């Protein structure tokens, strides 16, 4: 079984993913972390040395490679999860799970590429992107409330997975 976690960077994908993989006895992997370890460069460092196109294509490649495993929980980056092609690929391999957080939570927890708190960046700079990426995230097989503590979100996912895929 392949389980994909999608949503904004500050939605707890990585943490919930680990807890989830532990309760299902399957390995956990985070695309961005794998992309960096493979290139030996930080994400920022990546679109610098190499263009972003090279990064956007790299993370998709990494996603596919990770998806060779039949049992695994894979957390995705903000953009990758908002990539419909990558999202459709994910559905053809397993269950996609959108850990949804409201705009106010996003604003207080997330940061931009320069690690600056979004709560201090101009609003118009990120409101449209949040609204648009969320429209793609919503296309997920399963959607759970990510405002809750990580352990509670895991129970939500498990309960959803249980009544599922019969």
Curated annotation (Swiss-Prot):
Belongs to the shikimate kinase family. Catalyzes the specific phosphorylation of the 3-hydroxyl group of shikimic acid using ATP as a cosubstrate. It comes from Aquifex aeolicus (strain VF5). It is an enzyme of class 2 (transferase). Monomer. Binds 1 Mg(2+) ion per subunit. GO terms for cellular component: cytosol. It catalyses: shikimate + ATP = 3-phosphoshikimate + ADP + H(+). Its cofactor is Mg(2+). CDD domains: SK. Substrate binds at residues 32, 56, 78, 133. This is Shikimate kinase. GO terms for molecular function: ATP binding; magnesium ion binding; shikimate kinase activity. ATP binds at residues 10-15, 116. Keywords: Amino-acid biosynthesis, Aromatic amino acid biosynthesis, ATP-binding, Cytoplasm, Kinase, Magnesium, Metal-binding, Nucleotide-binding, Transferase. Pathway: Metabolic intermediate biosynthesis; chorismate biosynthesis; chorismate from D-erythrose 4-phosphate and phosphoenolpyruvate: step 5/7. Mg(2+) binds at residue 14. PANTHER family: SHIKIMATE KINASE, SHIKIMATE KINASE 1, CHLOROPLASTIC. It comes from the Bacteria. Its EC number is 2.7.1.71. The gene is aroK. One of its GO terms (biological process) is amino acid biosynthetic process. It is found in: Cytoplasm.
């Amino acid at each position: 079984m392949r389980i994909y976690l999608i949503g904004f960077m500050c939605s707890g994908k990585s943490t919930v993913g680990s807890l989830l993989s532990r309760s299902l006895n399957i390995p956990f992997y985070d695309v961005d972390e794998e992309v960096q370890k493979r290139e030996g460069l930080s994400i920022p460092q990546i679109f610098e040395k190499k263009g972003e196109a090279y990064f956007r294509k790299l993370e998709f490649e990494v996603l596919k490679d990770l998806s060779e495993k039949e049992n695994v929980v894979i957390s995705t980056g903000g953009g990758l999860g908002a990539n419909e092609e990558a999202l459709n690929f994910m559905k053809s391999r397993g269950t996609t799970v959108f850990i949804d957080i409201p705009f106010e939570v996003f604003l207080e927890r997330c940061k931009d590429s320069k690690e600056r708190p979004l709560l201090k960046r101009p609003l118009d700079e990120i409101k449209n992107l949040f609204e648009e990426r969320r429209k793609i995230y919503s296309k997920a097989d399963i959607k759970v409330k990510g405002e809750k503590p990580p352990e509670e979100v895991v129970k939500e996912i498990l309960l959803s997975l249980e009544g599922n895929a019969l």
